[PDB]
Amino acid sequence: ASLTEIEHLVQSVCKSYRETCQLRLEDLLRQRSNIFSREEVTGYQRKSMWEMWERCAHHLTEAIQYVVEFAKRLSGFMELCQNDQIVLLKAGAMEVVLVRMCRAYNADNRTVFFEGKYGGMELFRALGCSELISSIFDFSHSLSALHFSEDEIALYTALVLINAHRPGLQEKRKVEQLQYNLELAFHHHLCKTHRQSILAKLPPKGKLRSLCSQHVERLQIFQHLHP
Ligand SMILES: Cc1cc(CN(CC(C)C)S(=O)(=O)Cc2ccccc2)ccc1-c1ccc(S(C)(=O)=O)cc1
């Protein structure tokens, strides 16, 4: 590996993301002034927890589809044995989604883009899990504060997935290979864009994990009931 090949990896990771980022940043931003009227909010609040579950599950299913496509477009990823490909996605896809989420988050009025407009967290009242919902908003707020760029997301979420410490891995060292190269790519690019400052300011890989497991387990009470 040289700097030229690292930069190729960077450029590549950033192009897989672009091809799989699901929603254009520019559409997201242009629509920040498109906010739910309190009438429309009230409409969401009257819905049963189940209707809301149906919608959220669909949006999360759709989101995860894109994360998978992203990972497939990661060099090295497909070369992995298929057991490991599962292991990584099963452990990492949700975390990546929670990270991608901040693109759709407006920190200036603490709202999120949901089904065509921006709404605050009271939109989700019917689900009856506001500690989970607020913690997600806080997590997205933290990242929006860093002004986390598209390429930073690309490189950062790649490392979320490509983690050789996931229990279950058969050919661990191949993952370390990809992991190590992605860390180099990520760190290098920070220098090139003068964003060294954010590493210290990122939420701990613990924080992402305890959010996602807390998240997945309220998902799993919802899908007990109600496939
Ligand atoms: C994935 C998603 C979800 C939501 C709905 N939920 C989050 C809000 C409550 C913030 S939930 O489903 O996760 C909550 C929930 C559901 C069930 C049980 C417990 C908890 C709203 C916007 C998105 C979204 C879609 C696309 C992008 S992208 C890549 O930029 O294009 C980013 C974000």
UniProtKB/Swiss-Prot annotation:
Q: What induces it?
A: Up-regulated in the state of obesity.
Q: Which chain positions lie within coiled-coil regions?
A: none
Q: In which tissues has expression of this protein been reported?
A: Isoform 1 is widely expressed in many tissues, including liver and adipose, and highly expressed in skeletal muscle. Isoform 2 is primarily expressed in immature thymocytes.
**Impact after mutating A63F:** Completely abolishes transcriptional activity
Its quaternary organisation is:
Interacts (via AF-2 motif) with the coactivator NCOA2 (via LXXLL motif). Interacts with the corepressor NCOR1. Interacts with CRY1. Interacts (via AF-2 motif) with the coactivators NCOA1 and PPARGC1A (via LXXLL motif). Interacts (via AF-2 motif) with PROX1. Interacts with FOXP3. Interacts with NR0B2.
The role this protein plays is: Nuclear receptor that binds DNA as a monomer to ROR response elements (RORE) containing a single core motif half-site 5'-AGGTCA-3' preceded by a short A-T-rich sequence. Key regulator of cellular differentiation, immunity, peripheral circadian rhythm as well as lipid, steroid, xenobiotics and glucose metabolism. Considered to have intrinsic transcriptional activity, have some natural ligands like oxysterols that act as agonists (25-hydroxycholesterol) or inverse agonists (7-oxygenated sterols), enhancing or repressing the transcriptional activity, respectively.
Q: Which disease is it linked to?
A: Immunodeficiency 42: An autosomal recessive primary immunodeficiency characterized by increased susceptibility to concomitant candidiasis and mycobacteriosis. Candidiasis is characterized by persistent and/or recurrent infections of the skin, nails and mucous membranes caused by organisms of the genus Candida. Mycobacteriosis is characterized by infections caused by moderately virulent mycobacterial species, such as Bacillus Calmette-Guerin (BCG) vaccine, environmental non-tuberculous mycobacteria, and by the more virulent Mycobacterium tuberculosis.
Quote the protein name from its UniProt record.
Answer: Nuclear receptor ROR-gamma
Taxonomic classification: Eukaryota, Metazoa, Chordata, Craniata, Vertebrata
Q: Which gene encodes it?
A: RORC
Which residues of the entire protein appear here: the answer is 265 to 491 of 518
